[PDB]
């Protein structure tokens, strides 16, 4: 029962990141006065499945100066990891469940730390570095926030927990600023406008980057209904939809940051401001 | 230069640093004096679940 | 109860691979691995909160200086000598007597114990940490500083 | 709007020199300091809470619900001239 | 050997209100043996008085009001042993059957 | 002669000391440099932690708890500190020693 | 614009059709809609002892 | 080879995770039959000394 | 009640006082520090007991400090003043395994930080050896300390796991045959810190 | 994992319960609560999909050799790696705390914690190490 | 074998450092507050206070010359001498409150209505 | 709170009953347990059933029912 | 403290040195003991419980049939 219901969970999650992927590209297209992809199949809604399968015939490259085991390790453990946090979402009770998520969240920074050591390019080990140390300097900002949501989390007994089903069913009016923070956050980590700077997969084709993107868009939908359930009071489909429009919408809209500028952004404004909104909670909390 | 000059040109070169700061403080000022001034103000078993009880049946 | 024994049986045989291989970069692949197996194990123990800690702080953080590290110091010399040379059997030969035939274990006179699951809660040890061990609480945090304001003025200009 | 910041600046050498000299002032295409509490307040939720990223984000949602101008080749061409 | 035992956990849930009200120098009893003596032989009499009490308690409330004892019952099963998720069905069966013997 | 739990426990100590003393001897048996060497140090520290979670468990007391919280603390900035030695030290000496961070050559 | 409504609706709709399948399936597995909710020692303790005396009426019934 | 490597860790996990049990086996029996050992020569002592102790 | 407990509130304020003074005095480009040198013997004097060997240590430590000139020398020799002064009233083996652990990761970084000259990369390659030997001796204590607790179920510190801690302390004394650390660390490693 | 003792078992004697255990469906509300075991079935079911994404392209695409097909195409991270170990280790002693609820002398103790450090943040802060200019 | 039920929202009232005695003097207050502790201390204790402010001022303005910064030097040094007096003090009258030290000056003057 | 303080107060009612019937299920199986072992040790000389280790303090079984593995 | 203690002298003399471990242990998390109860209680007892059982205000020891 256990494997089948990790499959039925595991079915809805590549429809949708098929299904973002094509509405990432139409309303990207609609905001700049244009259709997007309308010509394959019925308006256009065969194009993510065409991609899949074109990139299924399409060639391997291994290349013969790389290590071929890390090399193919890499996108599999972006793909398993992202896999792995869908199920931690929908099939656990654990008391620490949003700690479990932010573990899994940090492994994966592993796969572009793979991909910049096996492939023998001269800058994809100058950008990994880079991706790696976005991903990195964020995840504390994240870290930060999660205790700032903990202090109010209990259940009926009055234990407290970070279990999902014990975040109450109403928006979160009192973290607007921790809540802005957290989605900004969620755009760095996926490496989305406007961090989008650093890629670090100039050597996959056909199936190994298409691992690679569908890894790319299930943790986005992860952290999308994880800033659901801590701040908008509960996990839907339509809050799914919303956050990713405005994902969407704000990499139609804004340009991107140099590195060191998001390094000063991450290390000089993120930190310090969850760092004190959790102290100001914890006094409040008392 | 005052306070208020200094302020100013603070907020006004770093205002993330000052506005962090000001959180910080009105977090430990709270704690150490709002809270104490005006917030802070053997039965056997069958006494405490009558009073539950009570508090249950009115609402 | 094979898998579980298993997975125990497991930490010790990525702990002799680590040192075994001649790449640094499986060494470090072994040592997550392990990490990770480990965290495994100390939830069979019941505990959810420190095994996550050992994830998130080891392979999260750690591993990530050590892959960096290794990544931007390390040629490739394992002909030069890494498999030229071999390895030292006195070694090998303290390693057998020590830790497979284990002439001084740490039950001493015992050989067999029972193994009993435990059930973490955290508010214990929230309780413990802020008011039974506050100033190890306070000597580790002086710790941690002395790291910080240490690798920044070490740090190679 | 056009005007320059203090912190805002792109490059080194104008921010090592905008927070050890005030040569900023002199230039009238700065904005000048805050002088009193309303003034703070405005240049504070121009800092924080964006607004700035708003007002574009906003043209964009206007576009998301305005008229396009693809034609639909080759069931529909474009407009050429006799002279082509 | 005998088969001792009470009832389920959302059932003990459920009659918790009238183990107090009803069997009240049972649970004294125990409670003072058990802070006395660690053996468990030593309070073997009390122990069993308990769980008669407890039974005979469970066996009176299926005679008088069976229906409202076990929908309240299954309710606190479904919801995790939530008070908070059945509060019409815990007014209903204490109002079938109440806590203390009223117009006494 | 003896159960599961027995089974469960003695395999779960012959483990850790057989990962203690691989963490003590191995990686200087094998001859490897000083990076692979902090690694074997983590892994000393791991077996060591697990103990004191095992030991925590198996008395129901806290102190392996806390142990085990300062050997994470302790074995992380020991650890940052000889990466950062390390990087110093290779920058300081490659110029004429090529080996450097191998000190078991 | 009206190109980009359909592949919205059909994010929602997906999420709707699995979300459901997925609840009742672990319905079927677990026969109470509290099964995610988080539990203690005194609650793990509750549901095992109810578990081993749930086996134990079933083993007592195949004897009369 | 890659095809190698991964069949080589594959035969190295499995022949440890068969091998060492028994290992840990012989060691638990050893100890058992030196505890019995020494409860049988406790009995002993305690029966001398129970003769000669009044 | 925390008020047989000011003197360790003293020592935490004093500490964040004096990060914060020696960032202000850095910010102004002063080349030197008898100020805040002065100021770090004040706080040695004023966090030590009234004992003959606490004092002992204590003048002894502020007689030391007019060797040493950086703000983060005199802060990484404070922060080991801690564990040296600690360790005298440590009971159990936890809080000894902090304050030796302490001490090392101090002695480590000013071997690192203080070296000038040509003897610097050998005295960074002796500090890297100290680091090595002394991880392994600390694994050591770990084990052995993890043995005692197994086995007696207290903090108490009897029976035949303390000969290994025995000769942890016998290490940290620079004892032969574990002698050649020190031996090490004396040929290059300045003479402050020696 | 099965129950090897009568006590385990809650003292309920005969051979249905040992087999009944055995053969066992997974439930959170019987005998694993909080269990952890849906994360291994997860990662064993994702690296055999991701497994089969790698090989398939190895079978139903056409392939060619070339030898250029087969061909290539600072201390700041040093800085955020061990600051973010340290931040990381806080932020682990920081979660105990909020998972309670704490009273008074306990919030004094974590603002204690807390303050040292910021202290040690603001000095790196204000040397200029978080200006990553190099 | 039966835990307790757990109650999560009391917390142990406990201090970190045990003073393992009994008081040897009349009880006056078991748990004074910082108010409590400053209102009822002695002149000796301002004093000792004042003393080392003022060494403090005195030593700081000679360190501080050198680097030519001597008045922002001996204010911190007279703040940071004069509040590690101040910790002295409160504790010395605090424990004077509690009954660990003697206290007959002040059992005549904490207890209004409970003088004789 | 008010709910916790509820659920706390309902569990203070429920611990005594449960460990009450947790201790006479303990007795039937220790009665079950001697039984077997005067079976077993029947001809053994000296051999006494029943023999309790300690001298003051009951001793609790090491493995309980509510303590299990998580994975 | 939990792993650190301080030794200072009694002015007047009248202080017994005793185990701090022991002392620190006795105020921190005290000491629980128990007595066997006497036989003559538990048959006491054991026949005031038969007579409620056989008098009828007990119920069984088991709420199934
Ligand atoms: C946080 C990080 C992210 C991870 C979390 C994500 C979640 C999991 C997702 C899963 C991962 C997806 C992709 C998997 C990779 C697929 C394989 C691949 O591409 O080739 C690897 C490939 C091999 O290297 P290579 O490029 O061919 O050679 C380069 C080296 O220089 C060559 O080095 P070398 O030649 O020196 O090494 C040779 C070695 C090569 O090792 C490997 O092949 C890699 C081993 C691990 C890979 C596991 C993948 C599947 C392999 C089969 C597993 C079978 C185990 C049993 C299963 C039951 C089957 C019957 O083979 C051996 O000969 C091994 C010798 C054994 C030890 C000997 C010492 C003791 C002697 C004592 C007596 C002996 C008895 O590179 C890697 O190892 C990449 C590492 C990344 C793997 C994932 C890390 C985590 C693994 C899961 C968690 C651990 C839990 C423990 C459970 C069981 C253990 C796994
Ligand atoms: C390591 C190598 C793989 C080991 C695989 C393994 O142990 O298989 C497991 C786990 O593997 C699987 O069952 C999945 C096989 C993976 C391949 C499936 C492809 C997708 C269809 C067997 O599960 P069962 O015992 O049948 O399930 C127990 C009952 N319960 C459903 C409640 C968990
Ligand atoms: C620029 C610096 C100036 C410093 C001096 C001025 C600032 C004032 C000093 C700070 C406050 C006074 C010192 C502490 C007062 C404790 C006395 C007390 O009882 O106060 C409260 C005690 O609570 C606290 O605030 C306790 C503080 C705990 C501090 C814990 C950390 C101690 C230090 C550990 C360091 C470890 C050692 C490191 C080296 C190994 C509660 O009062 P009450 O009992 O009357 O109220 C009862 C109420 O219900 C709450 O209890
Ligand atoms: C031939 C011999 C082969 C020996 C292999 C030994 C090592 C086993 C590694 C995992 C094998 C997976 C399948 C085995 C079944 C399994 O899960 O076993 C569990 C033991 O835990 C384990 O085995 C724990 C190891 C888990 C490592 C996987 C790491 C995943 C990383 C992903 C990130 C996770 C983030 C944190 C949540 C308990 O099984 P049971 O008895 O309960 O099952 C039946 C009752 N239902
Ligand atoms: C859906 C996706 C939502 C996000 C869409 C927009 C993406 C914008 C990305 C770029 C944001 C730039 C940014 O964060 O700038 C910082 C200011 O804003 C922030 O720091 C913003 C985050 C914090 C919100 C405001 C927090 C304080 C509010 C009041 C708190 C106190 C009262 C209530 C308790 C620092 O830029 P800077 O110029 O300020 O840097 C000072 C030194 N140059
Ligand atoms: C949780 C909340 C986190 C808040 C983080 C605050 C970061 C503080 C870093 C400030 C460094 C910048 C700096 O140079 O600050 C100087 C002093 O600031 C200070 O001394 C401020 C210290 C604040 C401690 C908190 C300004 O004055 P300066 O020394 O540069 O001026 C005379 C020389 N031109
Ligand atoms: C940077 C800015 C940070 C902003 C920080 C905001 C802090 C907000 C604190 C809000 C406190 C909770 C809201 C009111 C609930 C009180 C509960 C209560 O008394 O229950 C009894 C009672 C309920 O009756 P019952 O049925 O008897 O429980 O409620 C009241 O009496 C509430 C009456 C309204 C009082 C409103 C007070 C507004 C000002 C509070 C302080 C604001 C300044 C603090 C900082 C100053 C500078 C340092
Ligand atoms: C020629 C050699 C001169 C050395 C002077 C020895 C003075 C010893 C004084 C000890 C004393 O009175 O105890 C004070 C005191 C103990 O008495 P209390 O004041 O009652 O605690 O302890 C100290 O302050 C000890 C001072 C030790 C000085 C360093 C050790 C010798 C150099
Ligand atoms: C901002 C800079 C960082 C502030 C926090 C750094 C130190 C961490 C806090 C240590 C607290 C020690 C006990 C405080 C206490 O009991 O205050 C209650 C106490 C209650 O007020 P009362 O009515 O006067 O007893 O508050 C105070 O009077 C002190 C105000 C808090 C000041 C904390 C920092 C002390 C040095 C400046
Ligand atoms: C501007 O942004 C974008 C990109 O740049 C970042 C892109 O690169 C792409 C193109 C890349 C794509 C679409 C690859 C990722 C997605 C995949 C492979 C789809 C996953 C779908 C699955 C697994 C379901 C399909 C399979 C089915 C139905 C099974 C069929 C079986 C039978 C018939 C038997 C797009 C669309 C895009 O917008």
């Known amino acids: ?79 398993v990891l992202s896999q792995v946090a869908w199920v931690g979402i929908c099939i656990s009770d654990a008391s620490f469940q949003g700690l479990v998520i932010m573990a899994i969240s940090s492994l994966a920074v592993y796969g572009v730390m793979l991909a910049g050591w096996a492939s023998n390019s001269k800058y994809a080990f100058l950008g990994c570095l880079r991706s790696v140390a976005l991903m990195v300097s964020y995840e504390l900002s994240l870290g930060a926030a999660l205790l700032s949501i903990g202090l109010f989390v209990t259940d009926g007994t009055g234990m407290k927990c970070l279990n999902f089903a014990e975040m109450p069913t109403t928006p979160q009016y009192a973290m607007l600023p921790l809540c802005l923070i957290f989605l900004v956050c969620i755009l760095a980590e996926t490496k989305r406008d406007p961090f989008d700077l650093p890629g670090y997969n100039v050597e996959y084709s056909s199936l190994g980057f298409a691992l690679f993107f569908i890894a790319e868009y299930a943790n986005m939908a992860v952290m999308s209904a994880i800033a659901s359930i801590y701040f908008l009071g509960g996990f839907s489909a339509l809050k799914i939809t919303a956050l990713f429009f405005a994902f969407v919408w704000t990499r139609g809209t804004l340009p991107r940051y140099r590195y060191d500028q998001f390094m000063r952004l991450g290390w000089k404004a993120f930190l310090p401001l969850t760092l004190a909104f959790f102290a100001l909670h914890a006094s409040v909390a008392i | 230069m005052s306070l208020g000059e200094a302020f100013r040109t603070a907020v006004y070169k770093e205002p993330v640093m000052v506005w962090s700061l000001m959180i910080y403080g009105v977090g430990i000022s709270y704690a150490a004096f709002v809270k104490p001034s005006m917030i802070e103000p053997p039965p056997s078993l069958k006494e405490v679940m009558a009073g539950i009880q009570a508090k249950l049946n009115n609402k | 109860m094979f898998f579980e024994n298993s997975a125990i049986l497991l930490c010790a045989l990525l702990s002799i691979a680590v040192g075994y ?137 | 709007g056009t005007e320059r910041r203090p912190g805002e600046s792109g490059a080194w050498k104008q921010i090592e020199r905008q927070r050890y000299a005030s040569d900023w002032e002199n230039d009238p295409t700065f904005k000048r300091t805050p002088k009193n509490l309303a003034e703070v307040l405005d240049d504070s939720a121009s800092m924080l809470l964006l607004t700035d990223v708003w007002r574009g984000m906003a043209y964009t949602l206007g576009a998301f619900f305005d008229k396009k101008v693809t034609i639909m080749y080759p069931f529909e061409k474009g407009q050429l001239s006799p002279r082509f | 050997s005998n088969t001792v035992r009470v009832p389920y956990s959302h059932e003990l849930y459920a009659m918790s209100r009238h183990v107090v009200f009803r069997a009240e120098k049972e649970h004294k009893a125990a409670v003072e043996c058990k802070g006395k003596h660690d053996w468990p032989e030593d309070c073997k009499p009390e122990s069993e008085a308990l769980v008669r009490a407890t039974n005979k308690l469970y066996k009176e409330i299926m005679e008088k009001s069976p229906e409202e004892f076990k929908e309240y019952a299954q309710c606190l099963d479904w919801y995790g042993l939530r008070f908070s998720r059945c509060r019409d069905k815990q007014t209903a069966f204490e109002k079938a059957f109440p806590i203390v013997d009223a117009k006494k | 002669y003896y159960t599961e739990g027995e089974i469960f426990g003695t395999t779960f100590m012959y483990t850790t000391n057989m990962m203690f003393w691989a963490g003590i001897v191995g990686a200087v048996a094998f001859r490897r440099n000083l990076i692979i060497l902090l690694l074997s140090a983590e892994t000393v520290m791991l077996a060591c932690n697990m103990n004191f979670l095992f030991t925590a468990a198996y008395l129901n007391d806290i102190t392996g708890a806390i142990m085990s919280i300062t050997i994470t603390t302790i074995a992380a900035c020991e650890t940052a500190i000889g990466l950062a030695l390390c990087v110093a030290y290779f920058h300081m000496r490659s110029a004429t020693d090529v080996e450097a961070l191998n000190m078991l050559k | 614009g009206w190109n980009a409504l359909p592949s919205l609706v059909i994010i929602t709709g997906i999420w709707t059709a699995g979300l459901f399948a997925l609840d009742k399936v672990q319905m079927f597995r677990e026969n109470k809609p509290a099964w995610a909710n988080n539990k203690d020692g005194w609650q793990k303790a509750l549901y095992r002892r109810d578990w081993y005396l749930q086996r134990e009426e079933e083993t007592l019934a195949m004897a009369k | 080879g890659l095809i190698r490597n991964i069949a080589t860790f594959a035969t190295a996990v499995v022949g440890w995770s068969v091998g060492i049990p028994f290992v840990v086996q012989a060691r638990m029996n050893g100890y058992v039959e030196r505890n019995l050992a020494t409860y049988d020569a406790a009995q002993r002592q305690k029966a001398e000394e129970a003769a000669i102790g009044g | 009640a925390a008020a047989a407990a000011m003197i360790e509130l003293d020592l935490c304020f004093g500490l964040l006082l004096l990060i914060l003074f020696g960032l202000l005095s850095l910010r102004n480009g002063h080349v030197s520090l008898a100020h805040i040198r002065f100021i770090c013997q004040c706080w040695l004097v004023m966090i030590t007991p009234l004992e003959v060997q606490d004092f002992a240590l204590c003048i002894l430590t502020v007689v030391l400090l007019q060797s040493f000139h950086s703000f983060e020398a005199l802060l990484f020799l404070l922060l080991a003043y801690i564990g040296q002064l600690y360790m005298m009233h440590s009971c159990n083996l936890v809080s000894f395994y902090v304050c030796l652990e302490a001490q090392t990761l101090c002695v480590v970084v000013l071997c690192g930080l203080l070296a000038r000259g040509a003897s610097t990369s050998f005295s960074v390659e002796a500090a890297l050896k100290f680091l090595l030997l002394s991880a392994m001796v600390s694994g050591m204590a770990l084990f052995w300390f993890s043995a005692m607790y197994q086995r007696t179920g207290s903090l108490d510190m009897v029976g035949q796991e303390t000969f290994w801690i025995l000769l942890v302390m016998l290490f940290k004394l620079g004892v032969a045959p574990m002698h050649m650390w020190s031996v090490d660390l004396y040929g290059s490693i300045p003479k402050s810190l020696l | 994992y099965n129950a090897w003792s009568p006590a385990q078992r809650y003292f309920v004697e005969g051979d249905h319960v040992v087999t009944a255990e055995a053969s066992r469906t997974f439930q959170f509300t019987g005998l694993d609560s909080g269990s952890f075991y849906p994360y291994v079935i997860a990662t064993v079911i994702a690296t055999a999909i991701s497994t089969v994404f790698i090989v398939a392209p190895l079978v139903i695409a056409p392939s060619r050799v070339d030898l250029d097909k087969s061909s290539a195409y600072s201390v700041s991270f040093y800085l955020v790696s061990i600051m973010y170990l340290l931040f990381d280790i806080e932020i682990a002693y920081l979660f105990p705390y909020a998972m309670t609820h704490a009273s008074l002398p306990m919030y004094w103790t974590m603002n204690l914690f807390l303050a040292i450090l910021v202290a040690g943040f603001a000095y790196e802060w204000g040397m200029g190490a978080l200006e990553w200019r190099e | 074998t039966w835990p307790e039920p757990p109650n999560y929202y009391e917390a142990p009232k406990h201090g970190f450092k045990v003073t393992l005695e009994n008081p040897t003097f009349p009880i006056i207050n078991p748990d004074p507050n910082i108010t409590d502790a400053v209102t009822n201390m002695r002149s000796e204790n301002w004093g000792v206070v004042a003393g080392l402010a003022g060494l403090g001022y005195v030593a700081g303005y000679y360190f501080g010359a050198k680097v030519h910064w001597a008045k922002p030097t001996a204010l911190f040094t007279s703040i940071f001498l004069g509040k590690s007096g101040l910790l002295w003090g409160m504790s010395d009258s605090a424990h004077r409150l509690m009954g660990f030290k003697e206290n007959s000056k002040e059992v005549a003057a904490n207890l209004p209505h409970v003088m004789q | 709170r008010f709910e916790a303080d509820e659920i706390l107060t309902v569990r203070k009612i429920v611990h005594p009953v449960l460990q009450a019937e947790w201790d006479l299920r303990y007795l039937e199986h220790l009665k079950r347990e001697r039984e077997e072992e005067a079976k077993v040790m029947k001809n053994v000389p000296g051999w006494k059933v029943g023999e309790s280790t300690t001298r003051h303090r009951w001793l609790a079984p090491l493995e309980s029912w509510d303590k299990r593995p998580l994975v | 403290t939990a792993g650190f203690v301080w030794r200072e002298v009694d002015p007047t003399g009248q202080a017994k040195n005793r185990n701090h471990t022991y002392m620190y242990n006795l105020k921190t998390f005290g000491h629980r003991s128990y007595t066997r109860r006497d036989p003559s209680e538990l048959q006491a007892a054991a026949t005031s419980v038969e007579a409620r059982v056989k008098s009828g205000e007990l119920g069984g020891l088991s709420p199934l049939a």
């Open chain 1, 1 to 79: 029962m256990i494997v089948a219901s990790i499959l039925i969970l595991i079915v809805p999650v590549l429809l949708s990141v098929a299904m973002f992927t094509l509405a990432e590209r139409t309303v990207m297209a609609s905001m700049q006065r244009r259709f997007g992809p309308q010509v394959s199949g019925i308006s256009g809604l065969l194009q993510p499945f065409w991609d899949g399968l074109k990139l299924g015939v399409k060639e391997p490259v291994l290349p013969d100066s790389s290590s071929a085991g890390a090399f193919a390790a890499s996108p599999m453990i972006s793909f």
């Open chain 3, 21 to 157: 291989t001649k790449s640094p970069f499986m060494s470090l692949m072994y040592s997550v691995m392990l990490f990770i197996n480990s965290s495994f194990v100390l939830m069979m123990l019941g505990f959810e909160f420190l095994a996550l800690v050992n994830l998130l702080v080891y392979v999260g953080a750690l591993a990530v200086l050590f892959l960096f590290v290794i990544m931007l110091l390390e040629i490739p010399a394992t002909e030069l000598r890494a498999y030229s040379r071999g390895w030292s059997t006195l070694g090998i030969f303290v390693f057998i007597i020590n830790g497979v035939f284990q002439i001084t274990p740490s039950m001493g006179p015992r050989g067999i114990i029972t193994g009993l699951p435990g059930a973490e809660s955290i508010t214990n040890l929230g309780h413990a940490l802020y008011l039974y061990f506050a100033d190890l609480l306070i000597l580790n945090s002086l710790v941690l500083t002395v790291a910080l304001f240490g690798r920044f003025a070490i740090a190679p200009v």
